[PDB]
Design a protein around this ligand. Structure first.
Ligand SMILES: [Mn+2]
Ligand SMILES: [Mn+2]
Ligand code: NA
Ligand code: NA
Length: 327
DNA sequence: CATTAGA
DNA sequence: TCTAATGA
């Protein structure tokens, strides 16, 4: 956590680089189990060899470790860090919709800068166009103060359309968060569950309304169950307009709402921990259900959930408020 | 790990 | 159809 820190750190620098600038999934995969491993190690690693003893760590990485130990640096990281090509690939990648592969390609063509990307808006798909469009607005955190107004709105229109819709703004906002990166609304309806062969309109009506009133101003992708876009708060009485924000809305078979909600509410760790616990408790938990366990090794048979509680109750735990699902 | 865009 | 990019 702090003992092997630089180690795992330089290791991640490395991995990350293989995978993005290079297309070496393998080495990239190497650097990672290793970092995964040197991370678990309970002692200060003093040299390659000591590390080396570890599974995943070979001679190549061990060699990195010595130089890194002997000098608080590494040439390859120093070389990479300098590499404009590589820098470039790193940066483009930030644009929403630009992945490594495309990052690679643009570079090839010679588009390294934001402005490059601009003179070439033609070569970008819609997603990336939008990503290019709100580049600044997307990199900003979402002050809670705003999350509240946004949530306020989404809720209202939702209710305005069907009275029967249930919405929940999940995420860190759900958990207290002073700010968030985007907004995740999970939604469901009574007339939509595991069986009852869809009703795409469910998602659609809603998107439509939010759009109607000008909440959503752009579409990243809209399927029949996962809508992904951009919203904005009505930029009041001038002088101050609101930054463009990412928003995701996803339909959920009401019969799996709570699990889902439970899940996306997080945090990553409270989750795992809870998950690890349901296990002992003779259970199973994933983003949609909770199945009681069985001795033959495994079992199925989805228990009925009516609220975050049922789940809690199942694994016989203390209801933990969102605020405290921190870990 | 599953969902959408695109080509 | 597959391959990319988001997500969480
Ligand atoms: Mn989120
Ligand atoms: Mn999101
Ligand atoms: Na080894
Ligand atoms: Na990106």
């Amino acid at each position: 956590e702090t003992l092997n820190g630089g180690i795992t750190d330089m290791l991640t620098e490395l991995a990350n680089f293989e995978k993005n600038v290079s297309q070496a999934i393998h080495k990239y995969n190497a650097y990672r189990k290793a970092a995964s491993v040197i991370a678990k190690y309970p002692h200060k690693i003093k040299s390659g060899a000591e590390a080396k003893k570890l599974p995943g760590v070979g001679t190549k990485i061990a060699e990195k470790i010595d130089e890194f130990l002997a000098t608080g640096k590494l040439r390859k990281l120093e070389k990479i860090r300098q590499d404009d090509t590589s820098s470039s690939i790193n940066f483009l990648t930030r644009v929403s919709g630009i992945g490594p592969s495309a990052a690679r390609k643009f570079v090839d063509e010679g588009i390294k800068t934001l402005e490059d990307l601009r003179k070439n808006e033609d070569k970008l798909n819609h997603h990336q166009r939008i990503g290019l469009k709100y580049f600044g607005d997307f990199e900003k955190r979402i002050p809670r103060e705003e999350m509240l107004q946004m949530q306020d709105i989404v809720l209202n229109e939702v209710k305005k359309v069907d009275s029967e819709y249930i919405a929940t703004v999940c995420g860190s906002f759900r958990r207290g968060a002073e700010s968030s990166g985007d907004m995740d609304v999970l939604l469901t309806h009574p007339s939509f569950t595991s069986e009852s062969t869809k009703q795409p309109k469910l998602l659609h009506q809603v998107v439509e309304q939010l759009q109607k009133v000008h909440f959503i101003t752009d579409t990243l992708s809209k399927g029949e169950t996962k809508f992904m876009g951009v919203c904005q708060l009505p930029s009041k009485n001038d002088e101050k307009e609101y930054p463009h924000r990412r928003i995701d809305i996803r339909l959920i078979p009401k019969d799996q709402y709570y699990c889902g909600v439970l899940y996306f509410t997080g945090s990553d760790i409270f989750n795992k921990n809870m998950r690890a616990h349901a296990l002992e408790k003779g259970f199973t938990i994933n983003e949609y259900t909770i199945r009681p366990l069985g001795v033959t090794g495994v079992a199925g048979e989805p228990l009925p959930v009516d609220s975050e509680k049922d789940i809690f109750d199942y694994i016989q735990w203390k209801y933990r408020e969102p605020k405290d699902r921190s870990e």
